[PDB]
């Protein structure tokens, strides 16, 4: 339906431009609250970044 | 510094399940650099699209 079509187009922005538009962000945030595995996944992505950054000089 | 900014954003995600702008930056860089994470994000959206297109009356 029309809402599914809008989600499909948001998927294309991610696929073609590597940008997460607002509607996609909110879906991803809902997923953080409804999927313990994905919640862990996202924490892992950020943890990878943090651990490297914490021990950096600059 | 980048480390403690990331750490604070991880806590926001854990507590509230919303993604601060500074964490979104990191997430976008990850999906631009990591084919599997890019597809994992698409899978989240694909499920939302599929659900939005559920059988329904009009």
Author numbering:
A (entry chain B): -3 to 0, 210 to 263
B (entry chain A): -2 to 0, 210 to 264
Tell me, in the authors' exact words, what the paper reports.
The SAS-5 Implico domain comprises a novel type of protein dimer. Each chain features three α-helices (A1 to A3 and B1 to B3) that interact in a pairwise manner (A1–B3, A2–B2 and A3–B1). Proline residues at the linkers between helices allow for tight 90° turns, resulting in a very compact dimer of just ∼4 nm in diameter. We found that this newly recognized domain is highly conserved amongst Caenorhabditis species. Structural and biophysical analysis suggests that SAS-5 can form tight dimers through its Implico domain, a novel dimerization interface with no known homologs outside SAS-5 proteins. These dimers cannot be disrupted even when diluting the protein to concentrations as low as 20 nM. We envision that SAS-5 would readily dimerize even at low concentrations via the Implico domain, as oligomerization of this domain is tighter compared to that of the SAS-5 coiled coil. As anticipated, coiled coil disruptions in either SAS-52–265 L141E or L141E/M167E mutants yielded a stable dimer in SEC-MALS experiments, mediated by the Implico domain. Furthermore, we found that a SAS-52–265 I247E mutant, where the Implico domain is disrupted, displayed a single-step thermal unfolding profile as measured by CD with a Tm similar to that of the SAS-5 coiled coil in isolation (compare Figure 5A). SEC-MALS analysis of the same construct shows a concentration-dependent trimerization, again consistent with formation of just the SAS-5 coiled coil. Our work shows that formation of these tight SAS-5 dimers through the Implico domain is necessary for SAS-5 localization to centrioles.
